[PDB]
Design a protein around this nucleic acid. Structure first.
Lengths: 100, 77, 271, 149
RNA sequence: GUUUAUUAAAAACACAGCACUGUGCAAACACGAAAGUGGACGUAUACGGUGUGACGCCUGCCCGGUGCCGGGAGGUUAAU
């Protein structure tokens, strides 16, 4: 299956929905037997440039090896969703470790 | 027709005398309106198509005075 | 597709048909069908109030749903049918509880695709859902004006509406003629563009494919005598007038937008 | 118009005065709601003893029943756990009716049109400071706390 | 194809195609003192109007005039 590194953001007034979003998203992965490897929730670190009037959004990183029909529909749940800002999905190459 | 219920007004005809006295028959229409009145004898809104002077009579005389006049001549409020 | 015909006879040399292999080759669903008497352009007074319509083939009306008021029920699109009344094709939707309706067909809607209405639906193309829940930017059609009115805007072939803003309890639209206009956000809309966008490429060939489509010949006002038209007269195609209607109103560049009741909802005008 | 009054109209109406209201204001608002009477030379004689001293507190016990009907509920809360969408975007907004049908069943027996809502018609699930109308001068607060299901 | 029945059947009219323009829908426009009907049980890939008249190669310069359109400062200006 494909490895992927999924960093995304959450607006900070809804940063208390974050373990609900993480737990739901990793369950929706787990239906596809997507072996989770990382869950490094970074917290609410200050942005560089002004994103969307209010800065300092919450980051999440989830880094799973999954198949394609779940990572696609998962990414559409990043799009059609008010909380998530500017999600991204990346390269495969053999994942899972404690690193920042 | 365009008959005000209260004052009995109806459009009266007459010339439209121009700047050089060319007569042309126009028709003076009355200022009607479909105003919705409240009657506390019936505790409900009786709607009357009236003039504006027929709202000035209801401004003086009561709504039961005017609906008493249509009680006299025997129309339908 | 787009079929350019072959000149077997003159008057075939300029035909292009739009041969759609998806559509149903059979008689339509009768419990949603009724008659439709043509007027010929005439009204209660019996006079041709709008000119140049008459004749044509018979065409029975299809009760096509627009309001999409089976709310919260799945729906299988069962076949595509040709509709005489519209530029776009209709789809025979089968709801789960054994009710059939017609809908307008969006672009990607093939047979067996599962659409559904309601507020609690996915953002799949074909679904009906209200405008405070449609994501801004996403392209809708079968747009309403008033909530529960049914659908007024973007309901012809290939015609869409981009939702552009969300102003409190409003939605600022970019209509197909390029006119930004506000609607109330509780109005339902149907996702995607409308199908059969190839209808722009039909070129009709000959006079008869106009005359059986309902059209009647439109006589230029120059060919008439001066009592008939405000143009007209002159021995040898004189014109010399500023071009107008048969009723003397200036045609060709003279705006007639005077409502003022519906100037609240307009933001931008057609440019 | 010179119109005598019944209610204390907030600007100028003061319980029995010759008030210059306008023609339409005397007619569409004060008459059918019954908060004032066009009195000119005849209802004043009806108004002096029969209506000034006797009937005034007979109206003002209804003004007492806003301090009483307001304070039927001293708990002053509403819990609405509607079914919320996929982490956000609630199913249906809450106008007058869900609050009225709950507070009627759990709280103050009040009608539908008194349900006032400053912060919209309750889209987003959470705490919502929701105030009510019982009198022109009396204003209540029953805090809605919308829960997600 | 149509056309002056009863002296003119044509090079005229119409046509498919092209353009300009108006119309956001209780549409413009039309018939109606009006209610209302047509437009259309259609909704800008739709509808009305005006010219030109398949197809091919093309459609130059002029906003002074007369329109239409945009502007809104300043002047002039009605009943009041």
């Amino acid at each position: 299956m494909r490895h992927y590194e999924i960093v995304f953001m959450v607006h900070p007034d809804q940063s208390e929905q974050v373990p609900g979003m993480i737990e739901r998203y990793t369950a929706a992965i787990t239906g596809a037997e997507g072996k989770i490897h990382r869950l490094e929730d970074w917290g609410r670190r200050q942005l560089a440039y002004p994103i969307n009037k209010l800065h300092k959004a919450h980051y999440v990183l989830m880094n799973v090896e999954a198949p394609q029909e779940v990572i696609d529909e998962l990414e559409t749940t990043f799009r059609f969703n008010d909380a998530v800002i500017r999600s991204m999905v990346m390269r495969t190459k053999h994942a899972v470790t404690e690193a920042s | 027709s365009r008959v005000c219920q209260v004052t009995g007004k109806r459009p009266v005809t007459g010339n439209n005398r121009s700047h050089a006295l060319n007569a042309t028959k126009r028709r003076f229409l009355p200022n009607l309106h479909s105003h919705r009145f409240w009657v506390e004898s019936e505790k409900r809104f009786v709607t009357l198509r009236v003039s504006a002077k027929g709202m000035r009579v209801i401004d003086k005389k009561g709504i039961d005075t005017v609906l008493a006049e249509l009680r006299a001549r025997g129309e339908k409020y | 597709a787009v079929v350019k015909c072959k000149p077997t006879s003159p008057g075939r040399r300029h035909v292009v048909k739009v041969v759609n292999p998806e559509l149903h080759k059979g008689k339509p669903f009768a419990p949603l069908l009724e008659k439709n008497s043509k007027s010929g352009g005439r009204n209660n007074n019996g006079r041709i109030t709008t000119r140049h319509i008459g004749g044509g083939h018979k065409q029975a009306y299809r009760i096509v749903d627009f309001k999409r008021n089976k709310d919260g029920i799945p729906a299988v699109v069962e076949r595509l049918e040709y509709d005489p009344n519209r530029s776009a094709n209709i789809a025979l939707v089968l709801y789960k509880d054994g009710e059939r309706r017609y809908i307008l067909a969006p672009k990607g809607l093939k047979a067996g695709d599962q659409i559904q209405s309601g507020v609690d639906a996915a953002i799949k193309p074909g679904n009906t859902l209200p405008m405070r829940n449609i994501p801004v930017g996403s392209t809708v059609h079968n747009v309403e004006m008033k909530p529960g009115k049914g659908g007024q805007l973007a309901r012809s072939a290939g015609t869409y509406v981009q939702i552009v803003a969300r102003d409190g309890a409003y939605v600022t639209l970019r209509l197909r003629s390029g006119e930004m206009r506000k609607v109330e956000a509780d109005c339902r809309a149907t996702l995607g563009e409308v199908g059969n966008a190839e209808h722009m490429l039909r070129v009709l060939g000959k006079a008869g494919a106009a005359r059986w489509r309902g059209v009647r010949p439109t006589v230029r006002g120059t060919a008439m005598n001066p009592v008939d038209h405000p143009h007209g007269g002159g021995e040898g195609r004189n014109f010399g007038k500023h071009p107008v209607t048969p009723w003397g109103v200036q045609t060709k560049g003279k705006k007639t937008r005077s409502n003022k009741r519906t100037d609240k909802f307009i933001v931008r005008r057609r440019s | 118009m010179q119109v005598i009054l019944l209610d204390k109209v907030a600007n100028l109406g003061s319980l029995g005065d010759q008030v210059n209201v306008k023609a339409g204001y005397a007619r569409n608002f004060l008459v059918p709601q019954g908060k004032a009477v066009p009195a000119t030379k005849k209802n004043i004689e009806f108004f002096e003893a029969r209506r000034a001293e006797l009937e005034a507190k007979l109206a003002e016990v209804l003004a007492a029943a806003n301090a009483r009907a307001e304070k039927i509920n001293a708990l002053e809360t509403v819990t609405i756990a509607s079914k919320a969408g996929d982490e956000g975007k609630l199913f249906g907004s809450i106008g007058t009716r869900d609050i009225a049908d709950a507070v009627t069943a759990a709280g103050v027996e009040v009608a539908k049109s008194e349900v006032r809502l400053p912060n919209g018609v309750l889209r987003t699930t959470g705490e919502h400071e929701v105030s009510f109308q019982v009198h022109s001068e009396v204003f209540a607060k029953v805090i809605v706390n919308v829960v997600a299901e």
